[PDB]
DNA sequence: CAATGAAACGGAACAGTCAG
DNA sequence: GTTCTTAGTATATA
DNA sequence: TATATACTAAGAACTTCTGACTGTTC
C-alpha cells in the first residue's frame, strides 16, 4: 500500500459496570485485562512502528467528552503518534486503586449504544490528516449481545457497522471472558471479519515484542542491461540489514532541548 | 425574554407540513395551517402576556425559505447535500445508497426527488430523535450559513452532524427541503400571506422582510393604515406584461402614451440619504458593496453623488443597470465578458422612475408626475447616470415603427407605459407593457437542429428525460448524409409534458450511456457533456426559437443560444435535414448574432 | 522570597503537584537545574 | 367551464473552492 | 523541497 | 592494528498550478 500511509489502531473498551468489577475469581479482571492488553500493545508499538497512530476511547461511561458531545462516550487519548505521555495515562488506571480512580472520574458505566460508539470511532479516523495505510478498530467487551432489549438500536448497529466496513475501516473484537455468553454468532457474525470463553487472539497481543519494520521499499532501482542494448528494470531490495540502535540525539543538559550541532 | 419557538418542537412543524403536503385540497392545506398558527399565537400570548420582538418569523422563514433574506446563502444544494450525507453518514462511497443520493435523478417511483431518496436511505439508518425546537433548528441553519460565509467547511459539517444525528427521518427530509428552499407544499405563497394577515402580502411587496411582516402584523385584527415604500427598504419592483400589438391602443385606454427602448442590463433600485446610499437587486439582495455606500466608495456613487440637485437629500430611484463603453460611447449588453454587479468599461445607471423625494412619497402619483420629478431632481451625467427618455406616441403604427427601429438598432425591445398609472409593486402589467420581436409570429429566424444528448429530469419532470443536448451538422457531399455533428445548446422547454413523454418513449431504445473517456465519433462535445447520447440517425429534429446567438466556451460551435425553447418537434423532417455550420454562421453574421432582423408589417 | 535565588535546584520527582513544585520554587527564585549538572549539587 | 394568475424550472453566466 | 535512509568516513582502545 | 561509535555526507521517496464544481444569480 501507499508507503507514506500509516497504520492506525483505535482502542475501545466496554466501560459498563458489566466487566468493570466482574472478577468471578480473584486472579484476573477484564478491565485489568483489557487495559493490560492495551498497555502492552501500545508500548510494543512505541518501539516497533513509532510512525503509526493509536487511540483509546471508552464507551458507556458517565462523564462525557468527544468530538460531537454525545452520551456515554469518552475519548481518553486521541489519535496521534504514540508517546510516553500516554503510557503514563494508561498506567494511571492499572490497579484496584486505579479502577477506583477510573470509576470515580468517568463513571460506573451507564447505558450505551454501539451504533453511536462506532459513530465516534469513525469520526476519530476521519479527523486526522495523515494518510492511513491500514485502519483497524479493536473492541473490548464480552456482552456478546449488546442489547436484546431495543431491536432498533441493533438494526442501526448493523447499518452503521456495514457502512464502516465500506468506508475502508475494519473492525475486530476479541471475546475476552464471560460466565457463559461467549459466542460470536450472537449479533457479531455479521460484524467482525468455533468459540470459547477466552480469545487466543488477545494472547498474542501480549507477546511484548520490540522489533521494528520498514515497509515494501527499494534500496535502489537500477536498470539491469543484458548487453549494450537490452536493458531491464530491477529493484535492488534488502532482506537483512543488521539493525543498529537508533542514533541518539544530543540534549542540552538541563532544558532537555535539542542542541543543533554546528560543526 | 424567551420565545415560543423555543417551546415549539420542530416535529410539530414537520407534522403540519406533512399534513399540508398530503392534503388534496386548498381548503385542507389552509385548515392545517389554521390550526398550526392559531395554536402558535395562543402559546405566544400565554408565554408573553405583556414590549415584544418574538414573532412568527422563526417558523415562517422555514415555511417560505425562498423569501429568507436575513440568513446568508448556505452554499449547499442537492449535490453537496448527497456528498455530505455520504461523508457524515459514512456510507460506502460506491454503495447503492451513496450512488442513489449522488444520482437522484437517475431512476433505479421517486426519481428526481432528493427528498424521497434521502428519506428512504435514512429511514432504516438513523431513527434519530429528541425533539429539536424551531429555534435550535434556526440556530443550526444560521451556523451552517455563517460557516459557509466564514469558509469553514469543517464547521459546516459539524453543524450538519448535530442536525442529522438529533433529528428523525421525516424531520431531516423537511430540513433538506428547507435548505434547498423548495417544500412542494402545493399551496401558494400569496395564499400563506392572506393566511397570515390581510395586509401581509402588501407589506411584503414593499419591505421584503419576513421578520418585519411577522413583527408588525402579529395581530390578525390590527391592520396597517398606509403601507408604502420606505427608504432603504427593498420593495419588489413592478413588472411589465406581454403586450398585444393589435390591441395596444385599447390596452392604453385610447389615450396618449410613451414608447421607449428596453434596456438589456440588470434591474436595480437606489436609496439615498445625503451621503449614504443603498442598492437592492430585483430579488431584494444588497449590492451596496459593489455600487457604493458613500460618495467616496463604489463604482457608481462617487460618479453620481454630484449629479443630484443641491436640495436632494432623500431619494429612492428605480432604474436599469448597464455597462458603458467610454471609447465607443455605447452600451455593452448584459451577458458575456462582464458582470455589472462585479466589475475599461465604466459604471452607468439609467433611471426610469422615482419613488421618494425628501418628504413626498411618489408611489401613488401618476407616472407623468413621477417622470417630471425625475427630469428635475438631478442633472444627467452621460455614461455615469442618465434619464431613461420616454418618447410620446398615440397610435399602434408608432408602436410598430418603434419596434422596427429597435430591431434595426439590434435592441432587445420597447417599453410602452400608461401615463396615468401609479407604481404598483410586484405587479405584472397594470400600466406597463413589454414588446419584443420574439413575441411576434414570423419575425423570428428559428433553428431546426438535432437532439444529440439527454439528461434526466427532476421535480415534476423526474423519472423522464426532460431536456436534451442539441447539435448542428457538417456539410456533407452531394447525395450524402452528415456524419459529424457539433453541439450548439441545451434546450428543455417548449414542449407539453405529453409531447415530452411521447418523445421519451420514441427515443428510449436508442439512448446510450455517455463516456467522457470514450465519446462517440459522430457526436463531438465541447466542455458540456450529456448524460446519455443518441446516434444521429435515430434522433429527432426540433425547431428552436432563441433570442440571439452569443459566444460560448461550453459548445464547440463557439456560440450558444440565448433564451432557447422548442417551438415544434419536427417529425416531418429527417435527421439528416438538420442545418449545417454554414447555416449557423450565416445566421450569426446576418445581424451581429441577433436572430431577429425582419420588420413587422 | 528573595532567599532561594542564587541557589540551584533539581526537582525531579514528587508526583504533590510535581510541575507546581518548581513553580512554587520559581516564586522563591530557586535556580532550577531542570537536569542536574556538576554545577548543581542538591537534587530533590 | 374557462381565462387569469404563479409558480415552478430551465438554463446562463459567474468565481470561488477543492482536488489534484 | 523535506525527510529519509544509507555509508562510510571518521575516531579511539590494547 | 584491531573494532565501535560518531559523524556527516549523500540519495531517494515524500510537495510543487490548474481544472472542474456549485453554487449563485438572472
Curated annotation (Swiss-Prot), chain A:
Induction: In osteoblasts, by FGF2. The keyword Phosphoprotein applies. GO terms for molecular function: 5'-deoxyribose-5-phosphate lyase activity; ATP binding; ATP hydrolysis activity; ATP-dependent activity, acting on DNA; cyclin binding; damaged DNA binding; DNA binding; DNA helicase activity. Changing residue 131 to A: Abolishes adduct formation. GO terms for cellular component: chromosome, telomeric region; cytosol; DNA-dependent protein kinase complex; DNA-dependent protein kinase-DNA ligase 4 complex; extracellular region; ficolin-1-rich granule lumen; Ku70:Ku80 complex; membrane. Single-stranded DNA-dependent ATP-dependent helicase that plays a key role in DNA non-homologous end joining (NHEJ) by recruiting DNA-PK to DNA. Required for double-strand break repair and V(D)J recombination. Also has a role in chromosome translocation. Has a role in chromosome translocation. The DNA helicase II complex binds preferentially to fork-like ends of double-stranded DNA in a cell cycle-dependent manner. It works in the 3'-5' direction. The keyword Lyase applies. Individuals with systemic lupus erythematosus (SLE) and related disorders produce extremely large amounts of autoantibodies to XRCC5 and XRCC6. Existence of a major autoantigenic epitope or epitopes on the C-terminal 190 amino acids of XRCC6 containing the leucine repeat. The majority of autoantibodies to XRCC6 in most sera from patients with SLE seem to be reactive with this region. Its main location: nucleus. Forms a heterodimer with XRCC5/Ku80; heterodimerization stabilizes XRCC5 protein. Component of the core long-range non-homologous end joining (NHEJ) complex (also named DNA-PK complex) composed of PRKDC, LIG4, XRCC4, XRCC6/Ku70, XRCC5/Ku86 and NHEJ1/XLF. Additional component of the NHEJ complex includes PAXX. Following autophosphorylation, PRKDC dissociates from DNA, leading to formation of the short-range NHEJ complex, composed of LIG4, XRCC4, XRCC6/Ku70, XRCC5/Ku86 and NHEJ1/XLF. The modification Phosphoserine is found at residue 22. It is found in: Nucleus; Chromosome; Cytoplasm. There is a cross-link at residue 250 (Glycyl lysine isopeptide (Lys-Gly) (interchain with G-Cter in SUMO2)). The modification N6-acetyllysine is found at residue 2. One of its GO terms (biological process) is innate immune response. The chain holds residues 30 to 300 of 609 of the full protein. Phosphorylation by PRKDC may enhance helicase activity. Phosphorylation of Ser-22 does not affect DNA repair. Keywords: Acetylation, Activator, ADP-ribosylation, ATP-binding, Chromosome, Cytoplasm, DNA damage, DNA recombination, DNA repair, DNA-binding, Helicase, Host-virus interaction, Hydrolase, Immunity, Innate immunity, Isopeptide bond, Lyase, Methylation, Multifunctional enzyme, Nucleotide-binding, Nucleus, Phosphoprotein, Systemic lupus erythematosus, Transcription, Transcription regulation, Ubl conjugation. The active site is at 2 (schiff-base intermediate with dna). It comes from the Eukaryota. Belongs to the ku70 family. Coiled coil: none annotated. This is X-ray repair cross-complementing protein 6.
Swiss-Prot record, chain B:
It comes from the Eukaryota. Its main location: nucleus. Its EC number is 6.5.1.1. GO terms for molecular function: ATP binding; DNA binding; DNA ligase (ATP) activity; DNA ligase activity; ligase activity; magnesium ion binding. Can also use manganese, calcium, nickel and cobalt ions in the ligation reaction. ATP binds at residues 260-263, 267, 320, 334, 352, 412, 417, 434, 436. Residues 595-601 are annotated as: Required for catalytic activity. Mg(2+) 2 binds at residue 412. Testis, thymus, prostate and heart. Its cofactor is Mg(2+). DNA ligase involved in DNA non-homologous end joining (NHEJ); required for double-strand break (DSB) repair and V(D)J recombination. Catalyzes the NHEJ ligation step of the broken DNA during DSB repair by resealing the DNA breaks after the gap filling is completed. Joins single-strand breaks in a double-stranded polydeoxynucleotide in an ATP-dependent reaction. LIG4 is mechanistically flexible: it can ligate nicks as well as compatible DNA overhangs alone, while in the presence of XRCC4, it can ligate ends with 2-nucleotides (nt) microhomology and 1-nt gaps. It is linked to LIG4 syndrome: Characterized by immunodeficiency and developmental and growth delay. Patients display unusual facial features, microcephaly, growth and/or developmental delay, pancytopenia, and various skin abnormalities. Severe combined immunodeficiency autosomal recessive T-cell-negative/B-cell-negative/NK-cell-positive with sensitivity to ionizing radiation: A form of severe combined immunodeficiency, a genetically and clinically heterogeneous group of rare congenital disorders characterized by impairment of both humoral and cell-mediated immunity, leukopenia, and low or absent antibody levels. Patients present in infancy with recurrent, persistent infections by opportunistic organisms. This is DNA ligase 4. It comes from Homo sapiens (Human). The chain holds residues 7 to 616 of 911 of the full protein.
